């Protein structure tokens, strides 16, 4: 009743005593007079307010959330917000501020969320945040920052989330965040960063997510060894060329690590030790990788892709470290003699295409009851032991293409839905009577065993 709405806005009762006022998107300048001292929420988004120099309302002591996003603010006067004793959330995105207000924000002691994203902010006055003892989330996303405002951040010990993404920061010095001991998330993506101090993250005792994606990083960000609580790390799309030995020793809780779209050439054998929370590891094109990585500590990988390197041999015991592996892909390597993948009991897809494999034996794929696909395309495979596919019940797809198979070929297997044999050249002895029913996609080396023979799609060219 006595609370009441300003002209054109939509209001709502917040509880028995307070008022939720929405005045967004009715082009305005400075709204009042006659807004209720009992207003707890005030949306002034998407208007034309270029100055709230000629009011404001320092009487709104119950105001929890104030939205001024999407106006034309270029300047915030020292006392713009004096009197807002209950102010929890302050939204200022998408205006045209060029610096963070020097004083207007000091001592807003209840303030927990501050949005300054999408302005033209090139400067953070060193004490502009002085007094923000409750500040938990700070968004400076999409401005014109060129450097980390180290002094100004000193006094944000309670800060839990921050973005500085989409700015132009090119360097992070040691201790740049040294006092943000509560920080959980930090976003620095889409900046211009070519250099990290060796301690630039020292101080961030609580950090769990760290986002360096899309920068110009030159080398692996060693400063992470200190971030013990890290769960999510991103540095994809940089120009990092190697991942060192013991890269992640400091970060045992890592669940996700993104580093694709980096010209990574080498990785340390130890790089991924002790990552019990890691569930997938994929390394494409790490062309100078010679050895197979050690995975002690890292037993819960259910997918492991390591393509395009120069691994010639697997340790005999490799599956000891792969108890839960479901997908293995060592495509485009230098593998000749391969061991028994039997301990890899949960394996259900294998890809060894483009290696230097010549002989598969009884052991190699034995007792892999869950194994659905096996691709061995483009090897030197001459001799497949006759029982080698015997213990492979789930086996649906089998690609033996382009290797020097022949007399003799393939049986005791039979559950197939897909078979590729194309490119096998001493296999004119292409007898292939459909003993095994299940097949719905064949590829035969010679055109003839397609028509020479229930949708049996066949290749190459049925005559």
């Amino acid at each position: 009743g006595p609370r009441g709405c300003p002209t054109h806005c939509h209001c709502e009762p917040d509880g028995r005593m307070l008022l939720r006022v929405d005045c967004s998107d009715l082009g305005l300048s400075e709204l009042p007079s006659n807004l209720s001292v009992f207003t707890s929420y005030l949306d002034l988004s998407m208007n034309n307010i270029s100055q709230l120099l000629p009011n404001p309302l320092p009487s709104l002591r119950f105001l929890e959330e104030l939205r001024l996003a999407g106006n034309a603010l270029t300047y915030i006067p020292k006392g713009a917000f004096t009197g807002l004793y209950s102010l929890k959330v302050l939204m200022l995105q998408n205006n045209q501020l060029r610096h963070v207000p020097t004083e207007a924000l000091q001592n807003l002691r209840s303030l927990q969320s501050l949005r300054l994203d999408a302005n033209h902010i090139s400067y953070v006055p060193p004490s502009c945040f002085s007094g923000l003892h409750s500040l938990r989330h700070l968004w400076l996303d999409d401005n014109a920052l060129t450097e980390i405002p180290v002094q100004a951040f000193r006094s944000l010990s309670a800060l839990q989330a921050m973005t500085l993404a989409l700015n132009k920061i090119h360097h992070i010095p040691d201790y740049a965040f040294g006092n943000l001991s509560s920080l959980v998330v930090l976003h620095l993506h889409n900046n211009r960063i070519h250099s990290l101090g060796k301690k630039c993250f020292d101080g961030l005792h609580s950090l769990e997510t760290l986002d360096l994606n899309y920068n110009n990083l030159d080398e692996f960000p060693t400063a992470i060894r200190t971030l013990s609580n890290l769960k999510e790390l991103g540095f994809h799309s940089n120009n990092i060329r190697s991942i060192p030995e013991k890269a992640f020793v400091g970060n045992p809780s890592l669940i996700t690590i993104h580093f694709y779209d980096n010209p990574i050439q080498f990785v340390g054998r130890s790089a991924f030790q002790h990552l019990p929370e890691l569930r997938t590891l994929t390394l494409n094109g790490a062309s100078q990788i010679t050895e197979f990585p050690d995975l002690t500590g890292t037993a819960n990988l259910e997918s492991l892709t390591l393509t395009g390197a120069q691994i010639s041999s697997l340790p005999q015991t490799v599956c000891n470290q792969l108890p839960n592996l479901q997908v293995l892909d060592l495509s485009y390597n230098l593998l000749e003699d391969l061991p028994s993948f039997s301990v890899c009991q949960k394996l259900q897809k294998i890809d060894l295409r483009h290696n230097e494999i010549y002989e598969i034996k009884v052991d190699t794929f034995q007792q892999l009851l869950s194994l659905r696909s096996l691709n061995l395309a483009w090897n030197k495979i001459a001799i497949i032991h006759p029982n080698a596919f015997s213990t492979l019940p789930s086996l649906i797809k089998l690609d033996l293409s382009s290797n020097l198979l022949s007399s003799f070929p393939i049986t005791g297997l039979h559950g197939l839905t897909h078979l590729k044999l194309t490119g096998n050249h001493a296999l004119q002895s292409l007898i292939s009577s459909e003993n095994f029913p299940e097949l719905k996609v064949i590829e035969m080396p010679y055109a003839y065993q397609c028509c020479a023979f229930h949708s049996v799609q066949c290749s190459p060219s049925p005559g």
Binding site: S45, R136, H137, A161, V185, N190, S206
Partner: protein
């Protein structure tokens, strides 16, 4: 062509928004349509990207406003909020 949308379809609705705006893919019907809004709605957070700003769904158990996909800012009444996730029981102090 729609409000702050600078590229259209009948089938797909909006295809590119104005600079500082966000694109939401609204699913009606059999339909999935592009919409451009200045701030994202409740299920979502704003996610500024250089090529395309995008409203992204807040998927953190019992959260009603997040900062990012992983980090809640306000848990539903009356759960306890600790380090951006939502619990029944507040370990150590929320």
């Amino acid at each position: 062509c729609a409000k702050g949308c600078e590229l259209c379809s009948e089938v797909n609705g909006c295809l590119k928004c104005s600079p500082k705006l966000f694109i939401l893919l609204e699913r009606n019907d059999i339909r999935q349509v592009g919409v451009c809004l200045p701030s994202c709605p409740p299920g979502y957070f704003d996610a500024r990207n250089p090529d395309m700003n995008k409203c992204i769904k807040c998927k953190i158990e019992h959260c009603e406003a997040c900062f990012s996909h992983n980090f809640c800012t306000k848990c539903k009444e009356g759960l306890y909020l600790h380090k951006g996730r939502c619990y029944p029981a507040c370990p150590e102090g929320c």
